[PDB]
Design a protein around this nucleic acid. Sequence first.
RNA 1: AGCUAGUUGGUGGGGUAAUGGCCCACCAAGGCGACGACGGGUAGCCGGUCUGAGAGGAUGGCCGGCCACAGGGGCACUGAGACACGGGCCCCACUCCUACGGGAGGCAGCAGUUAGGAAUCUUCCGCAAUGGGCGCAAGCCUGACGGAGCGACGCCGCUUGGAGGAAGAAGCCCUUCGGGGUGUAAACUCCUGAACCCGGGACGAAACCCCCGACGAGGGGACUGACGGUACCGGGGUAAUAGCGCCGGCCAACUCCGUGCCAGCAGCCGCGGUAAUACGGAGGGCGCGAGCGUUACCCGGAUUCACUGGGCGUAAAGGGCGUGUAGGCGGCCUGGGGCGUCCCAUGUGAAAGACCACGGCUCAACCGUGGGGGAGCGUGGGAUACGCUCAGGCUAGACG
Lengths: 208, 99, 83, 138, 124, 71
Amino acid sequence: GRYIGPVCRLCRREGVKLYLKGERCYSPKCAMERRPYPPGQHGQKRARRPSDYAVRLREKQKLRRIYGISERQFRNLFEEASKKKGVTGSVFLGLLESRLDNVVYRLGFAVSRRQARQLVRHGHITVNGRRVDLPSYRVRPGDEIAVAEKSRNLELIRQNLEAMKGRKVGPWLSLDVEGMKGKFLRLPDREDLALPVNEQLVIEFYSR
Amino acid sequence: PKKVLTGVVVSDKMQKTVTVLVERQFPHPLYGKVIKRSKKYLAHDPEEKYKLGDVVEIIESRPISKRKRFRVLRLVESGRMDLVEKYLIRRQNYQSLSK
Amino acid sequence: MVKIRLARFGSKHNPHYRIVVTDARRKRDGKYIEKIGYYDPRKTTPDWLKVDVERARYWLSVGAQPTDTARRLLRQAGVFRQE
Amino acid sequence: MLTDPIADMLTRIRNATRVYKESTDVPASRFKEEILRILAREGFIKGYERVDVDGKPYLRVYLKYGPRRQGPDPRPEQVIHHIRRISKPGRRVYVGVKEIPRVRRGLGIAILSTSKGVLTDREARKLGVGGELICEVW
Amino acid sequence: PTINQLVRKGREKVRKKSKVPALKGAPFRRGVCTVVRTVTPKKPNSALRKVAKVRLTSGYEVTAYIPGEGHNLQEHSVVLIRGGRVKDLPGVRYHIVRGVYDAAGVKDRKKSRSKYGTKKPKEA
Amino acid sequence: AKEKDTIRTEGVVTEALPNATFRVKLDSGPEILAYISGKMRMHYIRILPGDRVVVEITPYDPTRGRIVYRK
RNA sequence: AGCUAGUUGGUGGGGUAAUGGCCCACCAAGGCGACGACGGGUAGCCGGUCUGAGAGGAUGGCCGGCCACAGGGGCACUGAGACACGGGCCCCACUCCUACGGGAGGCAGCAGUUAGGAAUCUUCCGCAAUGGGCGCAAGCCUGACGGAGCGACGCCGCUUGGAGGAAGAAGCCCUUCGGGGUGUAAACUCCUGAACCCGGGACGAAACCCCCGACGAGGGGACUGACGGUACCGGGGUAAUAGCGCCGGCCAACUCCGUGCCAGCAGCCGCGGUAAUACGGAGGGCGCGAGCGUUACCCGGAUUCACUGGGCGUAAAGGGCGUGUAGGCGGCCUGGGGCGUCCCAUGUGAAAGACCACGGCUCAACCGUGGGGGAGCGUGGGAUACGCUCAGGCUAGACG
Ligand SMILES: [Mg+2]
Ligand SMILES: [Mg+2]
Ligand SMILES: [Mg+2]
Ligand SMILES: [Mg+2]
Ligand SMILES: [Mg+2]
Ligand SMILES: [Mg+2]
Ligand SMILES: [Mg+2]
Ligand SMILES: [Mg+2]
Ligand SMILES: [Mg+2]
Ligand SMILES: [Mg+2]
Ligand SMILES: [Mg+2]
Ligand SMILES: [Mg+2]
Ligand SMILES: [Mg+2]
Ligand SMILES: [Mg+2]
Ligand SMILES: [Mg+2]
Ligand SMILES: [Mg+2]
Ligand SMILES: [Mg+2]
Ligand SMILES: [Mg+2]
Ligand SMILES: [Mg+2]
Ligand SMILES: [Mg+2]
Ligand SMILES: [Mg+2]
Ligand SMILES: [Mg+2]
Ligand SMILES: [Mg+2]
Ligand SMILES: [Mg+2]
Ligand SMILES: [Mg+2]
Ligand SMILES: [Mg+2]
Ligand SMILES: [Mg+2]
Ligand SMILES: [Mg+2]
Ligand SMILES: [Mg+2]
Ligand SMILES: [Mg+2]
Ligand SMILES: [Mg+2]
Ligand SMILES: [Mg+2]
Ligand SMILES: [Mg+2]
Ligand SMILES: [Mg+2]
Ligand SMILES: [Mg+2]
Ligand SMILES: [Mg+2]
Ligand SMILES: [Mg+2]
Ligand SMILES: [Mg+2]
Ligand SMILES: [Mg+2]
Ligand SMILES: [Mg+2]
Ligand SMILES: [Mg+2]
Ligand SMILES: [Mg+2]
Ligand SMILES: [Mg+2]
Ligand SMILES: [Mg+2]
Ligand SMILES: [Mg+2]
Ligand SMILES: [Mg+2]
Ligand SMILES: [Mg+2]
Ligand SMILES: [Mg+2]
Ligand SMILES: [Mg+2]
Ligand SMILES: [Mg+2]
Ligand SMILES: [Mg+2]
Ligand SMILES: [Mg+2]
Ligand SMILES: [Mg+2]
Ligand SMILES: [Mg+2]
Ligand SMILES: [Mg+2]
Ligand SMILES: [Mg+2]
Ligand SMILES: [Mg+2]
Ligand SMILES: [Mg+2]
Ligand SMILES: [Mg+2]
Ligand SMILES: [Mg+2]
Ligand SMILES: [Mg+2]
Ligand SMILES: [Mg+2]
Ligand SMILES: [Mg+2]
Ligand SMILES: [Mg+2]
Ligand SMILES: [Mg+2]
Ligand SMILES: [Mg+2]
Ligand SMILES: [Mg+2]
Ligand SMILES: [Mg+2]
Ligand SMILES: [Mg+2]
Ligand SMILES: [Mg+2]
Ligand SMILES: [Mg+2]
Ligand SMILES: [Mg+2]
Ligand SMILES: [Mg+2]
Ligand SMILES: [Mg+2]
Ligand SMILES: [Mg+2]
Ligand SMILES: [Mg+2]
Ligand SMILES: [Mg+2]
Ligand SMILES: [Mg+2]
Ligand SMILES: [Mg+2]
Ligand SMILES: [Zn+2]
C-alpha cells in the first residue's frame, strides 16, 4: 500500500511544485502559492545548511514522491538500471516513465498520478486489446494504451479528454482522442522529461 | 595416460624395492613465489638393477604391495650422490631439535 | 535399465518436462545422461515440444525404453516414422 | 655480490633522475641493454651507449627531464615520474596475455620479458604473449 | 616480513570472541531469577539500577538488567534474556525482555512500545 | 512516572568507605551502603563518620540508601 | 617431536569380480617425519550460497551430485548387486508381554506425540498427472509425487479511494497574544467500485486400450481428475485495516510541560544534580509500511594478519653476539635441453544457479527456451627473453 493522505502538504516539504494533486496544483490553491515553506511547527523558522547526506536524501524523496511509488519498488527499480548497460541515470527515468499508471497520466488520460493509479487499478485501461489493471506494468515501445469500450461512455473519461482536445502529448507519445487510444512511441530521454531533479544526487545517495 | 615422474634412488636397503624422491616446482597459490616440494615414492626393482643415487623414471603401475604402485622405467642420470647427500643430511638434522 | 522419460522442471501449476535419458533407478529429477527435449503440457508457447529425433533414435539402438507418455510424444515427433 | 642487477639498474636511474644527473653508468648486460632499448624507444631516456670504465663495460644512460619551471622549486617536472621493479628474485611474477595490465590507464608502460623478446605492455598485448612482468614505468 | 617468510609461516587469522556467551549462539535464552537487585553505577552516573541474577537454560548464572520505570520481577520469576550490555554497569552483559513469561511490560508506555513490551491502547 | 515507594528513614553514619560511601546505621533497623546524594556532593558538605543523616531507600533494594539530609 | 611390528620389503599361499600385508606362513630390516610423521581438537565434501571494488573472508539449509549411518557394537547369509532403515544371527542399554521357563520391539519413511529448546507444520485430499516395482495385458502397490492446510518465515504483486473543496471549521499544540501549527487534511460535493452476491466455468489429458493395417509405420476410435466448481470470463455492487522505529551528534526530524545525579535513556562518545531538542508525555516533524524495531550469527567498514594492501631509533616490534647446518637468493659471455613461464589446438568444466537475450502466468516473485563465459586438469604442437639445468669461457664479487 502506497502513501495515502495529504498530498499538497508534500508540495511544500520538497520546495518544488508537485502536481500529484492533478488540478488545483495549477489553480491558485496548491498551498505552493503563498505558502512555500515546509509544514509543521518549525516550518517558518530559518533552516540550517543541510548536510551532504541531507542534500541527496531530499533529491531522492523529491523524485520518488513524484511518481507515487513505495521505496521497495523504487529501490529495486534502481538496482535494475545499474546492471543494465548504459548511463544509470536516464535508464532509471525511462523505467519510471514506462509504468502503466504513469503512462495513463502522461497520455493525459488522468488528472493526477493517484487518479491514473485508480484508473488502472479498476481495470479501465486496455493495452493491445487486453485489459491490464496493474499500475506497475512496464509499458514497452509501441504498446497500445487504450480505454475500455465499457468505460468510454463514463462521464469522467469524456471529461478529461474534452480538455485533452488540442493539448499536445509527449514526443515519445501519441494518442487518438476521439477513439480514446494512445501509444508509447519510445522511452523518453532526459531532455524529454522536465523533471526538476538531479539524477546524479540520487545515484550518489545510493553509493552508501 | 599413466602418470610418469623422474626422481632419485635414496634407499637401496630393501629387497626388490628402492625408495625414490621426486621434486615438484609450482608457484604458491597466494604468495606466488615458486616453491619446491618433494614426495617419496616406493618403486619396484625386480632385478635389483638400479642402485643408490641413480636418477630414474617412474610410471603409474598395477599395485605391487601396500605403499607400492610405481615401477622403475629407465635410468636418466647415473649415480649422482650429491642429491643423496642433500636427502640424508636433512634426515640427520632431525636428531637435534627434540629435547 | 536405461530409460527415456520426462522430468518435471516446472513450477507449481506450471509443469515443464525435460525429455531426458536416465537410468530408471535414478530420481526423476535426478542427474540424467542426455537432455533430448522438452515438453509443455499447457501448450502456452507456439513451440511446446522439441525432440531432435536423430539423437533420440540413437539411444533406442542401444536399449533405452520410453514411457507410454514418452513413447506418445516421440511418435508425435515421428521418431518411429519410416517412410 | 649484487643481488638483482635490474633492480640496481632501475635504482641507479631512480637515484640518477632525482639529482638531475646528465648520465649514469650501469654494468653492461644484454638483458639490461634490451631493457634500455625499450626506454629510449619509448622516449623515457635520451638514449644509451656502451662504455668501458677502467676496463669494465657499462651503459652510459642519458636521462631526460621536462622544462625548467616557474617560481619556488623551478626544478623541471620529471619525465620518468615512476619506476618500480615487479618480478623480483624470490617472488617471481608471470602474466598471461589476458593478465597484461593497463598502466596509468594507458599512459604508462609495463616492460615484459617474453620468449619472443623484451616488450612493452602494448607490444606484447598486440603480440598476444605473456611473461615476466618486470616493471612499471611512467 | 619476507615472501620466503610468509611462505614459511604465513598470516594468522584474528579469532573474535563472543561478547555474549548466551550459549548455543542462540538469539535469546530463558531462565529463572535468583535475585532482583538495584546496583549503583560507575563514576559518571548515579542511580539505582534494577538487575537480576538469572539461572539460564544454557547452564549460566549471569546478571541481567531490568529496563523500564518499574518492574514486577521477583526472586523466583522466570524471564528471557535479550543481550546487549549496560555501559555504566560492569559485568551486566545482557538485558531482560519485557513482555515475556513472568515479566510484564511497562505501564502507560506511549512512545516506544515495541521496546518494553506494551500493547496498543484505545482512543474513544 | 516516579513511583512513590521511597522512604526517608534516618540513621547514623558508621564507616567512611571509599568514594562517598558509608555504613549508615538506620535508627529503625540495620545499616545500608548509603552513598551521598548528588545535591549534597555538588554543595560538598563533608560528612563525618558519626553523623545523623536522612536516607532515601527504594524498596527494590533495602540494601542501598542515599544520604539526603546533611547532618 | 619423534611415530611404526603386519610395521616396511621379499618369496610362496589363501581370498575376491579384480590389484593389494587384505589375511597366513617364512625370509630380509626396514617404512614415515620439520615439505608437520605421531597425538589432540573440530568437521560430511562439493556444485553453490552470502559478502566484497576485488584478492579474500564466511558458509555447505533448501535444490543437485558423492560419502556415511539406520538404538550402539560385531557378524555373515541370500543375491548381478547388501554385510542390507521398514531382512537375519549375537552381545549391550531401553520399552512392552510374561504361566518367570521365555518372548516381541526399532519413525534419521509420511503426518502425529513427548522431551528439551528462543523456535520450526496437517495424525489432509488424491493415483487425474510424472516417475518406479511386478505383469502378455487388464490391473495392483507407491506418505516418491502431484495438490491442499497452517506460519507475514522470505520474495513478490495488491488494498485501505480519486477528483472538487476555506487565505482556511471544531479539538489538541505552540505564541512576542497580533497570530502560527496539525492542513485540502476532516466535514461535504461528485466519480469509481476492494470485499461480497449471481451464472458460465478451465488448461493440465494423451497415451496404455480398442478397431483398420501384419500387435510395425501410418490412420482411426474410446475411457481417464486430486487440485475443484478452484483459476478465468461475463454481470451486480458497498468509501471501505495502519501500523512501527526515530528526532544530541555519527544520522533525516523541535518545540511545550513534567521530573531535578531522582525516575531513567544509552551502539559509541554521553545526557539528568531546576529552562533537559538525550530522561517521561503531548503537539509537530523525520523514516519505512503490512509491516516495523531487537538480539544472536556471518561479511563489510578492517589497509586492524596488509598476495593485492602494514610495520619494528623514540608509538606494539631487531634475537645480547658469533659461527654455521638445512632452506631461500645468485656476476658477465656462449651453447644444448625446454622443467618453470607464455602461446595455439583439443578433451573437460553435469544440470541448476549466476550473466545477456527472448518468452509463459494480466505485472512481479516464480517458470520455460536459447546463448555465452569460466580458473583448474588431460593431450598434441610451437616459442626460449627470464627463472632452472648440463657444458664451456671470463674476472668486476669472494678468497689467496
Ligand atoms: Mg551488465
Ligand atoms: Mg548503468
Ligand atoms: Mg522518442
Ligand atoms: Mg559498495
Ligand atoms: Mg634394494
Ligand atoms: Mg608384493
Ligand atoms: Mg632419527
Ligand atoms: Mg536416483
Ligand atoms: Mg513416426
Ligand atoms: Mg601465534
Ligand atoms: Mg607374521
Ligand atoms: Mg601375493
Ligand atoms: Mg615431503
Ligand atoms: Mg622431505
Ligand atoms: Mg561431527
Ligand atoms: Mg575489503
Ligand atoms: Mg557481487
Ligand atoms: Mg562447514
Ligand atoms: Mg567448508
Ligand atoms: Mg529435507
Ligand atoms: Mg552403525
Ligand atoms: Mg546398528
Ligand atoms: Mg535381484
Ligand atoms: Mg549397510
Ligand atoms: Mg540390517
Ligand atoms: Mg530394506
Ligand atoms: Mg522405519
Ligand atoms: Mg528378555
Ligand atoms: Mg519446553
Ligand atoms: Mg509442510
Ligand atoms: Mg489416500
Ligand atoms: Mg500415479
Ligand atoms: Mg483414480
Ligand atoms: Mg503412473
Ligand atoms: Mg514390462
Ligand atoms: Mg498400502
Ligand atoms: Mg507435497
Ligand atoms: Mg482528499
Ligand atoms: Mg450524496
Ligand atoms: Mg455506484
Ligand atoms: Mg471479487
Ligand atoms: Mg485435462
Ligand atoms: Mg484436454
Ligand atoms: Mg486385427
Ligand atoms: Mg495412433
Ligand atoms: Mg472434477
Ligand atoms: Mg470515508
Ligand atoms: Mg541512517
Ligand atoms: Mg541532524
Ligand atoms: Mg523519580
Ligand atoms: Mg529512547
Ligand atoms: Mg550536571
Ligand atoms: Mg520545574
Ligand atoms: Mg524544565
Ligand atoms: Mg524532549
Ligand atoms: Mg538522541
Ligand atoms: Mg523524549
Ligand atoms: Mg506525537
Ligand atoms: Mg510488500
Ligand atoms: Mg525483519
Ligand atoms: Mg561498502
Ligand atoms: Mg565485524
Ligand atoms: Mg581485510
Ligand atoms: Mg589487529
Ligand atoms: Mg607487504
Ligand atoms: Mg601500523
Ligand atoms: Mg618500543
Ligand atoms: Mg643489538
Ligand atoms: Mg643468474
Ligand atoms: Mg639455484
Ligand atoms: Mg616447456
Ligand atoms: Mg580450455
Ligand atoms: Mg552451468
Ligand atoms: Mg511477459
Ligand atoms: Mg601441454
Ligand atoms: Mg629451441
Ligand atoms: Mg639458451
Ligand atoms: Mg661455469
Ligand atoms: Mg687472472
Ligand atoms: Zn500541489
